[PDB]
Amino acid sequence: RATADTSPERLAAIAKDALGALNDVILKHGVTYPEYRVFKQWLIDVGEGGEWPLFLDVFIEHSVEEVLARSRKGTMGSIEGPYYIENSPELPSKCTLPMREEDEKITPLVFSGQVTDLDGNGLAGAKVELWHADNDGYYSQFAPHLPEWNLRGTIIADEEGRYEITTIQPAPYQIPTDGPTGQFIEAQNGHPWRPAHLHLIVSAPGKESVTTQLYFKGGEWIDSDVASATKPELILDPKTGDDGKNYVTYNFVLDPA
Amino acid sequence: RATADTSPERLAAIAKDALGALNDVILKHGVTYPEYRVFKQWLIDVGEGGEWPLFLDVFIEHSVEEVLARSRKGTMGSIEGPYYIENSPELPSKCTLPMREEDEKITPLVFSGQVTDLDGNGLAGAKVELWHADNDGYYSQFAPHLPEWNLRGTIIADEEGRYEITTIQPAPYQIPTDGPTGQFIEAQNGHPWRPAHLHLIVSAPGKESVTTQLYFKGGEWIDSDVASATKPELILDPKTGDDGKNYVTYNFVLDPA
Ligand SMILES: Oc1ccc(Cl)cc1O
Ligand SMILES: Oc1ccc(Cl)cc1O
Ligand SMILES: [Fe+3]
Ligand SMILES: [Fe+3]
């Protein structure tokens, strides 16, 4: 039951700008009646396909985080995306993310670092909620065949704010091509792809949490993210060990609540 | 199964402008995350309530007709609205619109005029599709209690392009306040009202049809139409007879197909 405290005055100004802007694009490009019928049917399709969270997060949410970005001094944020789930099972500072026997076959990714405040003091009782896709680009709880907490966890950072999280390296994400979001994209010759990414919500007692994503230097779609959610500050350059595992360190800087 | 011949190049440019514009409004007004969740839930509600045609026609379609307005030299057009139905039963040049025993109690409106071309030559085989709401502001086929062609007809203009159509005078229209469209309006202190109006599609053999609406001089909401669909060229000034009926004449000027 979602709410916001927006005064009628504010909404009216937003509505005026949003609707005026759309209406101007129509006048600009000479949007015809047949094209208008196509837009109306496609908005119906979007909701009938359950793709409002998907369409909105891909095309709109980057600007919402960009707003929040201004008011923030810590680690760069990025969009949540639609694939977040609360209360993923807790795990200790040093852990391995829950995975299938399939996932065990993929080159491992060892993610290390520390949660700290703005001055660099480590934070006790910090939490790292991590979620990402498997090598097949699917999310648990958004794929029937997967264990419901595959590659999802609540990492409990130690008394010093540190974690050593062993996972696999995520595959790039492709947005279902079959639906209206993918229809919108195929019809303009765009591409339905996101670079490979880790999702992280990072919290601490008395701190303003951070929702962020982490990408990979080599990675494809790196310079053409369809959700426009990539920032260079969030690109990891993992180095590979003689065990053949990929090793990366990244620290989280939380703002005060 | 609705389609348009829009090249990927065009859609991409439209998409770029539409999405950029929205994204700018977000950056402009500092659209927060809670407000974003409210917008996402409301887009889901709109489609779940079957109010995409309603929301679009009220807030977007005026600009689509404004485009078509440029390419046209005949009678001013206006939006279709969501309440149009094809194949309304035919009636002769001089007729009375189908109505209930209730409607017979309302002051009658006698609508007369002629369908002509750009030079003022009358057009044989011209059709006047007329639809409007009853004094209770409901449309037939969008209200269970009404006969399915209440205040809907296909008037067959005579060999000379003339019609004398007796109906009642429509009541102002109020957009359902209970749904997401009305929620969007109540939440900004807007008003959910349209001035009283007749709907007309006017066609002739070899002519580009006209979808238009006709309003009434005294009428309330006349200068504040929520669908922004009012034009001064479409305001009727009916004069009343000694039978106590309201009499108005209006001619349709069709463009060539
Ligand atoms: O995996 C994802 C797919 C689409 C979006 Cl918008 C965000 C994601 O995080
Ligand atoms: O009766 C009507 C109600 C709403 C709209 Cl947008 C148009 C109409 O014609
Ligand atoms: Fe993702
Ligand atoms: Fe109407």
From Swiss-Prot, chains A, B:
InterPro entries, per the entry: 1_2-CTD_multi_dom, Catechol_dOase_N, Cchol_dOase_actb, Chlorcchol_dOase, Intradiol_dOase_C, Intradiol_dOase_core, Intradiol_RC_Dioxygenase
GO biological process: catabolic process; catechol-containing compound metabolic process
PROSITE patterns: INTRADIOL_DIOXYGENAS
EC number per UniProt: 1.13.11.1
Pfam families noted in UniProt: Dioxygenase_C, Dioxygenase_N
Catalytic activity: catechol + O2 = cis,cis-muconate + 2 H(+)
Keyword check for Oxidoreductase: yes
Cofactor note: Binds 1 Fe(3+) ion per subunit.
GO MF entries: catechol 1,2-dioxygenase activity; ferric iron binding
Binding-site positions, Fe cation: 139, 173, 197, 199
Cofactor(s) this protein cannot do without: Fe(3+)
Alphabetical UniProt keywords: Aromatic hydrocarbons catabolism, Dioxygenase, Iron, Metal-binding, Oxidoreductase
Family: Belongs to the intradiol ring-cleavage dioxygenase family.
The protein's name: Catechol 1,2-dioxygenase
Organism: Rhodococcus opacus (Nocardia opaca)
Source species taxonomy: Bacteria, Bacillati, Actinomycetota, Actinomycetes, Mycobacteriales
Gene giving rise to this polypeptide: catA
